[PDB]
Design an enzyme around this catalytic site. Structure first.
Site, PDB file in Angstrom:
ATOM      1  CD  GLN A   1      97.227 -12.185  41.862  1.00  0.00           C
ATOM      2  OE1 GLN A   1      97.014 -12.219  43.047  1.00  0.00           O
ATOM      3  NE2 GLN A   1      96.584 -11.158  41.216  1.00  0.00           N
ATOM      4  CD  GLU A  59      97.033 -20.695  38.984  1.00  0.00           C
ATOM      5  OE1 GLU A  59      97.440 -20.176  39.708  1.00  0.00           O
ATOM      6  OE2 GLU A  59      97.577 -20.373  37.658  1.00  0.00           O
ATOM      7  CB  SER A  82      83.977 -29.262  31.085  1.00  0.00           C
ATOM      8  OG  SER A  82      82.733 -28.805  30.577  1.00  0.00           O
ATOM      9  N   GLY A  83      85.396 -31.254  33.740  1.00  0.00           N
ATOM     10  CA  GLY A  83      86.311 -31.786  33.880  1.00  0.00           C
ATOM     11  C   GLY A  83      86.785 -31.749  35.422  1.00  0.00           C
ATOM     12  CG  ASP A 124      82.445 -36.019  29.324  1.00  0.00           C
ATOM     13  OD1 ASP A 124      83.572 -35.968  29.066  1.00  0.00           O
ATOM     14  OD2 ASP A 124      81.635 -34.802  29.404  1.00  0.00           O
ATOM     15  CG  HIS A 159      83.470 -32.415  27.212  1.00  0.00           C
ATOM     16  ND1 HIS A 159      82.758 -32.633  28.175  1.00  0.00           N
ATOM     17  CD2 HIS A 159      83.855 -31.053  27.242  1.00  0.00           C
ATOM     18  CE1 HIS A 159      82.727 -31.740  28.927  1.00  0.00           C
ATOM     19  NE2 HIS A 159      83.367 -30.571  28.337  1.00  0.00           N
ATOM     20  N   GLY A 211      84.131 -24.011  30.907  1.00  0.00           N
ATOM     21  CA  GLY A 211      85.524 -23.974  31.765  1.00  0.00           C
ATOM     22  C   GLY A 211      85.465 -24.640  33.112  1.00  0.00           C
TER      23      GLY A 211
END
Ligand code: CA
Length: 240
Positions: free
Chosen positions: A64, A59, A188-189, A93, A45, A186
């Protein structure tokens, strides 16, 4: 992640930020897990929209310079062929992104360990969700990667009437539901990391939460069960 704590920078090195181009800038939309130097596992999705995506590995703070990030385009998106955007509750999904370049591995960038095919965790198994998703229902994204302790809720409990009922399938993992900590938009995944035989492995790909809110008692966050897709994952990588 609602009710999380800030992750240490080197805790979850397979976590990635999946971002889409937004004007002259890039916006975080979903998490993912680096599974090969040139492949990322995420939710289907997350990549329904016809957007331009990039992956950021290494990350920590979205806003920043951390001195550790690598940025790479997405070259091919392979969504599970049974995924239906109209029907998240059906499952499937999951999607694989082949990266335009192989990333370089180091303390901040490592491959996520996946479970053996078919593995099901006992009820209340220790896991962490990580991500930069909303820190409150209808809130705002986290600046720094968050983690929350979310113990599993086994299928029998998770698919009972006061929990998710028929909405949850055996191809999914539920975790949390305490009304305080949860995934949120945010995340998700991204990964659900669960400790098994001394080693964290990625047992879930964050998929959905209640329409009523992120941290809702007896509505644990729901993840695609990675161990239901090991053959599929191996097949896609082998043929791409
Ligand atoms: Ca950064």
């Amino acid at each position: 992640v609602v009710g999380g704590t800030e992750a240490q920078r080197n805790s979850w090195p397979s976590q990635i930020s999946l971002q889409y181009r937004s004007g002259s800038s890039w916006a975080h939309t979903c998490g993912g897990t680096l599974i090969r130097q040139n492949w990322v596992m995420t939710a289907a999705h997350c990549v329904d929209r016809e957007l331009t995506f990039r992956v950021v590995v290494g990350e920590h703070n979205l806003n920043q310079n951390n001195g550790t990030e690598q940025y790479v385009g997405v070259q091919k998106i392979v969504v599970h062929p049974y995924w239906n955007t109209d029907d998240v509750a059906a499952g499937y999904d999951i999607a694989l992104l082949r990266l335009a370049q192989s990333v370089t591995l180091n303390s901040y960038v490592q491959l996520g360990v996946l479970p053996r095919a078919g593995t099901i965790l006992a009820n209340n198994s220790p896991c962490y969700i990580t991500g930069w998703g909303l820190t409150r229902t209808n809130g705002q994204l986290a600046q720094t990667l968050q983690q929350a302790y979310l113990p599993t809720v086994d299928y029998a409990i998770c698919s009972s009437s006061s929990y998710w009922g028929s909405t949850v399938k055996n191809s999914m993992v539920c975790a949390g539901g305490d009304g305080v900590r949860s995934g949120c938009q945010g995340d998700s995944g991204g990964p659900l990391h669960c400790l098994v035989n001394g080693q964290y492995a990625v047992h879930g790909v964050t998929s959905f939460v209640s329409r009523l809110g992120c941290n809702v008692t007896r509505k644990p966050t729901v993840f695609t069960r990675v161990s239901a897709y090991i053959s599929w994952i191996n097949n896609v990588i082998a043929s791409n």
